[PDB]
Amino acid sequence: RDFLQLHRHDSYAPPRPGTLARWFVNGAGYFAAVADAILRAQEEIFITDWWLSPEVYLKRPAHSDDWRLDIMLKRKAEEGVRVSILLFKEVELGINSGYSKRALMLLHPNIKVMRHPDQVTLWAHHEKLLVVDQVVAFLGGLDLAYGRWDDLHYRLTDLGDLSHNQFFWLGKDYSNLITKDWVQLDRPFEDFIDRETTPRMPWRDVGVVVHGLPARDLARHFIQRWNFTKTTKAKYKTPTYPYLLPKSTSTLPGGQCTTVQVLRSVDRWSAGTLENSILNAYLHTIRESQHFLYIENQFFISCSDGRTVLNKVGDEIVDRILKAHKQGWCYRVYVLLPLLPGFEGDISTGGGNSIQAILHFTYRTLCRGEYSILHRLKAAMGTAWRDYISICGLRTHGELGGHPVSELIYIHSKVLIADDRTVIIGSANINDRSLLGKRDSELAVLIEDTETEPSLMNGAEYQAGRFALSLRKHCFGVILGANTRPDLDLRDPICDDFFQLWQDMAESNANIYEQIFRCLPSNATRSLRTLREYVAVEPLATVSPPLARSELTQVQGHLVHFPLKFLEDESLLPPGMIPLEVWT
Ligand SMILES: C[C@@H](CN1CCC2(CC1)C(=O)NCN2c1cccc(F)c1)NC(=O)c1ccc(Br)cc1
């Protein structure tokens, strides 16, 4: 179909039936498939990134320069492939887009990088994209950047010429984002945290590859941004940055046949035009969902008040739950969030003001004030709200220094699954910054199944979609620990037995982690003053590692309940002249 008019959900691109699409959970498979695709490139590679680490290794463990992103692009450029890269130009964050740019363009003249914007603004280019020959396109939450590679093992430690290398995360790739922010990125092979005393923060994310027509659509977005960016400053207007043009006619890993629609958030400042089709697709999927929602997102800032927060995603969730309760439907909403925002902050002091600002708007959405999801649900249905929504996070544990250590798994995914039939995957967080269009630029794909699998839904036979069911089962299996308990029935995602098991695990795990590590966040610290005395106590993990180790044997999976009462007696907003909407 055409691009002369707008389409479903007011998107620039129509839905593409018969699209091969494959989802990825965690960075390990995404970066491997990116590496394989780069190797087979014949003409063009398009890349957009919020952050691009040139020296990141795409396959692990590294034994040579092969599979290192910069080396792979240099090799393809030497065969005549044109690499075009759109990088976010941060306000000197410490991501050093200048080093990424200078390093990539030093490699070969066939690699061209533009940065945007030049003008001062609060907003960023957030989309993550890699397109090969305008026929294969990767998108999702994963930047080609440090800290993103991980796998189901979610290793907390990495203790062991690279021919005999055993580290999975070399140098700057080994990090704990909450402990300390990245420094000295022009020294990629230098550690910046103590590998022997400070555990990794595991990184969880979701990506996707699409083939055919939706890859053309994503390439067309890149081309518009590329040619628009050309007009943004004199240096880029010169012929050394060629105009790009989309392929039009006659449009490989292992994907699933689905209907895929590309979606994006863009504005005048970020592109030629206004669009917020990710938001529209989010709302419509919630409105039309019939059985359950699974939401895994880095942020959860919503519930409009007309002033500070504007998007209506939370309101749609509330309306669906209120309707399910009114009609007597079995309906479940699963919300998976990172236990703490991804900023550098000593949580034992209370967290930085960035952490506190996000928590304010997160808790305003979840359970605090007249607009919160739980307050409107509680008002209508009392304690029955627990039958309809579950808010959880992830945590794991390991061993370091001869005693157990624990850290949350950072949920960076931006995925929604509905009814085991529909999936949204992209870069768009659930907040005003990602969804309004006017602010950050974002990408997403709407994936609707056309092929089905026999499954269950509240005890009844149910034809689930192949792409959506496999993703949801893979998420559920890793999160709840299905490897260790092969008796788990993950066919039915909404029946009482399974929903109870989900909540029971969340409560059981959260209690053990709190008993062993006294980890934050926690329901046991309702104010900063009780927080100050609470952290002055040495946890059992270090008091008696053997006793700690024994009790940790009862943890199943990584699922922990998201503590809704952490610091609930504090205002949490910082005082001051900064607009509050920087964080929303
Ligand atoms: C989890 C992350 C943080 N999130 C990034 C993505 C974030 C929100 C914050 C988003 O979700 N949208 C826009 N945005 C953002 C961020 C910073 C400036 C800006 F202008 C926009 N930490 C790291 O990966 C990270 C990497 C390098 C450095 Br140094 C610092 C952090």
Return the HEC string of 99-168. HHHHHHHHHCCCEEEEEECCCCCCCCECCCEEEECCCEEEEECCCCCCCCCCCCCCCCCCCCCCCCCCCC
Nearest to 416 by CA among 206, 150, 203, 108: 206
Q: How far apart are CA 566 and CA 351, in angstroms?
A: 12
Using CB atoms within 10 Å of the CB of residue 65, give its burial: 0 to 12 exposed, 13 to 18 middle, 19+ buried.
Answer: middle
Q: Do residues 452 and 286 lie in contact, with contact meaning Cβ atoms separated by under 8 Å?
A: no
Cβ neighbors of 411 (< 8 A, separation 6 or more) are: 204, 296, 297, 298, 336, 337, 338, 393, 394
Give the closest residue (by CA) to ligand 1 atom 26.
95
Q: Indicate the CATH number of 275-572 among 3.40.50.1110, 1.20.200.10, 3.40.50.300, 3.30.870.10.
A: 3.30.870.10
Breaks in the chain after residues (C–N exceeding 2.5 Å): 92, 160, 251, 575
Cβ of 93 closer than 6 Å to ligand 1, yes or no, is yes
Question: Reduced to 3 DSSP states, what percent helix, strand and coil does the chain have, rounded to the nearest 5?
Answer: 30, 20, 45
Give the closest residue (by CA) to ligand 1 atom 6.
126
Cα separation values, 493 from 241, 295, 335, 416, 459, Å: 51, 13, 14, 14, 10
Burial 390-414 (b: 16+ CB within 10 A, else e): bbbbbbbbbebeebbbbbbbbbbbb
Dist. CA 495 → ligand 1 center (Å): 37
292: part of which helix (H) or strand (E)? strand 292-297
Hey, what are 18's tokens? 């018969």
Using CB atoms within 10 Å of the CB of residue 120, give its burial: 0 to 12 exposed, 13 to 18 middle, 19+ buried.
Answer: exposed
Nearest to 472 by CA among 497, 450, 447: 447
Cβ neighbors of 450 (< 8 A, separation 6 or more) are: 17, 18, 257, 258, 259, 465
What's the sign of the alpha-carbon dihedral 208, 214, 219, 221? negative
Hey, what are 513's tokens? 């982690």
The number of beta carbons lying within 10 Å of the beta carbon of residue 515 is: 15
Cβ of 203 closer than 6 Å to ligand 1, yes or no, is no
Nearest to 359 by CA among 431, 300, 308: 300
Q: Do residues 393 and 339 lie in contact, with contact meaning Cβ atoms separated by under 8 Å?
A: yes
Give the closest residue (by CA) to ligand 1 atom 7.
126
Among 49, 115, 126, name the best residue to mutate to test ligand 1's pocket (greatest count of ligand atoms within 8 A of Cβ).
126
Tell me, what amino acid is at 129? L
Hey, what are 564's tokens? 């809704």
Please tell me what DSSP assigns to residue 501.
H
Active site residues: 126, 128, 133, 412, 414, 419
Q: Among the atoms of ligand 1, which is closest to the Cα of residue 143?
A: 24
SS3 (DSSP) at 483: coil
Dist. CA 343 → ligand 1 center (Å): 8
Dist. CA 172 → ligand 1 center (Å): 16
Burial 341-367 (b: 16+ CB within 10 A, else e): bbbbbebeebbbbbbbbbbbbbbbbbb
Nearest to 479 by CA among 301, 208, 294: 294
Cβ of 440 closer than 6 Å to ligand 1, yes or no, is yes
Nearest to 402 by CA among 552, 513, 543, 557: 543
Instruction: Specify the experimental method.
Output: X-ray
The number of beta carbons lying within 10 Å of the beta carbon of residue 308 is: 15
Packing angle of the helix pair 97-107, 69-78 (nearest 10 deg) = 40
Using CB atoms within 10 Å of the CB of residue 306, give its burial: 0 to 12 exposed, 13 to 18 middle, 19+ buried.
Answer: exposed
Cβ of 95 closer than 6 Å to ligand 1, yes or no, is yes
Q: Among the atoms of ligand 1, which is closest to the Cα of residue 147?
A: 24
Residue ranges of the domains in the chain? Answer: 20-252, 275-572
Antiparallel, parallel or unpaired: β 44-49 and 292-297:
unpaired
The number of beta carbons lying within 10 Å of the beta carbon of residue 481 is: 16
Q: Among the atoms of ligand 1, which is closest to the Cα of residue 434?
A: 12
Dist. CA 327 → ligand 1 center (Å): 41
Dist. CA 311 → ligand 1 center (Å): 21
Cβ neighbors of 517 (< 8 A, separation 6 or more) are: 397, 404, 405, 406, 539, 540, 541
Q: Do residues 390 and 410 lie in contact, with contact meaning Cβ atoms separated by under 8 Å?
A: no
Cβ of 453 closer than 6 Å to ligand 1, yes or no, is no
Q: Among the atoms of ligand 1, which is closest to the Cα of residue 342?
A: 1
Q: How far apart are CA 366 and CA 561, in angstroms?
A: 13
Q: Classify the phi-psi angles of 403: left when phi > 0, otherwise alpha if psi is within -120 to 50, otherwise beta.
A: beta
Dist. CA 384 → ligand 1 center (Å): 37
Same fold, 20-252 and 275-572: yes
Nearest to 281 by CA among 428, 465, 469: 428
Cβ of 143 closer than 6 Å to ligand 1, yes or no, is no
Hey, what are 94's tokens? 């410490």
Q: Among the atoms of ligand 1, which is closest to the Cα of residue 412?
A: 1
Q: How far apart are CA 88 and CA 98, in angstroms?
A: 10
Dist. CA 211 → ligand 1 center (Å): 29
Cβ of 177 closer than 6 Å to ligand 1, yes or no, is yes
- Helical segments of 489-527, H only: 496-517
Tell me, what amino acid is at 414? K
Give the closest residue (by CA) to ligand 1 atom 9.
342
Q: How far apart are CA 277 and CA 275, in angstroms?
A: 6
Q: Among the atoms of ligand 1, which is closest to the Cα of residue 93?
A: 29
Q: Among the atoms of ligand 1, which is closest to the Cα of residue 95?
A: 29
Q: Do residues 314 and 475 lie in contact, with contact meaning Cβ atoms separated by under 8 Å?
A: no
Tell me, what amino acid is at 101? K
Cβ of 344 closer than 6 Å to ligand 1, yes or no, is no
Where are the strands (E) in 316-426, listed by range? 332-336, 389-400, 403-408, 410-411, 414-418, 422-426
SS (H, E, C) 45-111: EEEEECCCCCCCECCCCCCCCCCEHHHHHHHHHHCCCEEEEEEECCCCCCCCHHHHHHHHHHHCCCE
Q: CA angle, 505 as apex, 504 and 508 as ends, to 5°? A: 85
Please tell me what DSSP assigns to residue 401.
T
Tell me, what amino acid is at 311? N
Resolution for this PDB entry, in angstroms = 3.2
Antiparallel, parallel or unpaired: β 414-418 and 410-411:
unpaired
Q: How far apart are CA 157 and CA 181, in angstroms?
A: 18
Q: What is the CATH number of domain 20-252?
A: 3.30.870.10
Cβ of 94 closer than 6 Å to ligand 1, yes or no, is yes
Look-up of token digits 């479940």:
332
Q: Rounded to 5 degrees, what are φ and ψ at 333? A: -120, 115
Hey, what are 199's tokens? 């555990």
Dist. CA 26 → ligand 1 center (Å): 18
Q: Rounded to 5 degrees, what are φ and ψ at 392? A: -135, 165
Cβ of 244 closer than 6 Å to ligand 1, yes or no, is no
Dist. CA 128 → ligand 1 center (Å): 13
Cβ of 340 closer than 6 Å to ligand 1, yes or no, is no
Please tell me what DSSP assigns to residue 271.
S
Give the closest residue (by CA) to ligand 1 atom 11.
429
Cβ of 432 closer than 6 Å to ligand 1, yes or no, is no
Cα separation values, 519 from 346, 539, 569, Å: 12, 9, 19
Cβ of 409 closer than 6 Å to ligand 1, yes or no, is no
Cβ neighbors of 269 (< 8 A, separation 6 or more) are: 117, 121, 123
Q: How far apart are CA 293 and CA 493, in angstroms?
A: 10
Rg of the chain, C-alpha, whole Å: 23
Please tell me what DSSP assigns to residue 440.
S
Using CB atoms within 10 Å of the CB of residue 477, give its burial: 0 to 12 exposed, 13 to 18 middle, 19+ buried.
Answer: middle
Q: How far apart are CA 83 and CA 287, in angstroms?
A: 41
